[PDB]
Design a protein around this ligand. Structure first.
Ligand SMILES: Cc1cc2nc3c(=O)[nH]c(=O)nc-3n(C[C@H](O)[C@H](O)[C@H](O)COP(=O)(O)O)c2cc1C
Ligand SMILES: [Mg+2]
Length: 308
RNA sequence: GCGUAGUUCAAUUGGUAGAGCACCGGUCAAAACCGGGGUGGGAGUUCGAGUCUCUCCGCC
């Protein structure tokens, strides 16, 4: 059984990847997307998005990390893929599910075939080239054309987020059966994604999709130890350990911090935690109106985890 | 439909805007190399709006 930490732009940066991988057993992390247009991006963009590149593409605890590209033009996906791996990335991921690029490639699977193929030919054969897709644009009727384009490009594996672009993040529309049909169609491995929140949902997803590998995104913020909950049926991280994890986060420094990073990300993480832990509602209200990093850092750090 | 740095572009359910060219500075007029990166106006909601909403303006 494999459990991958999902790419999450504005959420799962290197700091959060560091904190989660310490207390999880994630088999792999994907970075926030590197946006490609018509230009070989400079080295500093890759190091900013993926500081793990300077530790052999690993988090401090040792979990591997993979750079994701979002783009359309094959030549420039290829050249930025070659740079990513040359800098250390363990393979490269192609974004085909972000609402010229992202989910718009799902309208013409030829673009996916052509982009992924150029990336495959640019990256050393044994480093994986993966693709992350949604089921389609507005319906899922072209889902197999999308899947076929990934395989015939020569990609190593396919992550399928089991919704279309229009369905967004609405829970009713999750389609693990569609992922199963893609798995049965393809020779390359298929990784299921969407609405895995705990052990039960991960079991139902693996049972329905037939996938041994899963990827979890928002649930990994809701339950900070979700990989261990999913792999080993362990209980959710107790609330006092969650607060300790947030205290640790306030002590980490973000490079490029324009002043309000922790004001943003403590409140954002608490917003996720608020959907799982009752105690996160009171703590969000305690820090709600704090409008600068020193204050929110002071507020979080002052909590005695021993008395919670 | 779009409007974002001088300009060409980038920016996942709201979390605090970064690349190329141009430009300025440095090493030794220019070159080369190296370093440096403000959301059309206003309003609404929110602790927080490029992002959701209204209004006026501008371009298909
Ligand atoms: C805030 C947020 C940011 C995301 N950013 C990315 C991204 O940069 N690249 C990507 O391929 N998917 C991205 N996704 C999609 C997730 O990887 C994932 O497919 C989706 O959240 C469904 O999984 P889940 O139900 O476990 O959250 C993002 C999702 C969210 C909610
Ligand atoms: Mg966001």
């Amino acid at each position: 059984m494999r459990v991958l930490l999902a790419p999450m732009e504005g959420v799962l940066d290197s700091l959060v990847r560091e904190l989660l991988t310490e207390v999880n057993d994630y088999d792999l992390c994907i970075t926030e997307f590197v946006r490609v247009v018509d230009q070989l991006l400079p080295v500093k963009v890759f190091h900013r998005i993926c500081p793990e590149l300077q530790n052999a593409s690993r988090t401090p605890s040792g979990t591997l990390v993979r750079v994701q590209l979002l783009g359309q033009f094959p030549q420039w996906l290829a050249e930025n893929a070659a740079r990513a791996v040359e800098l250390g990335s363990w393979g490269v991921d192609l974004n085909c599910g972000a609402p010229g690029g992202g989910a718009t490639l799902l309208k013409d699977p030829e673009l996916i075939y052509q982009g992924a193929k150029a990336m495959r030919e640019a990256v050393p054969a044994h480093l994986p080239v993966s693709v992350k897709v949604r089921l389609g644009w507005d319906s899922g009727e072209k889902k197999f054309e999308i899947a076929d384009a990934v395989q015939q490009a020569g990609a190593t594996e396919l992550v399928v987020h089991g919704r279309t672009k229009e369905q967004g993040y609405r829970a009713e529309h999750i389609d693990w059966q569609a992922i199963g049909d893609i798995r049965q169609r393809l020779n390359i491995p298929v990784i299921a994604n969407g609405e895995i929140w705990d052990w039960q949902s991960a079991q139902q997803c693996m049972a329905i999709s037939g996938c041994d590998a899963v990827m979890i995104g928002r649930g990994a913020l809701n339950i900070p130890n979700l990989s261990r909950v999913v792999k080993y049926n362990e209980p959710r991280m107790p609330w006092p350990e969650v607060v300790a994890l947030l205290q640790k986060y306030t002590r980490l420094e973000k490079q490029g911090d324009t002043g309000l990073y922790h004001v943003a990300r403590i409140k954002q993480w608490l917003s996720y935690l608020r959907k799982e832990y009752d105690e996160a509602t009171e703590l969000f209200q305690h820090v709600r109106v704090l409008n600068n990093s020193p204050d929110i850092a002071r507020a979080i750090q002052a909590i005695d985890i021993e008395k919670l």
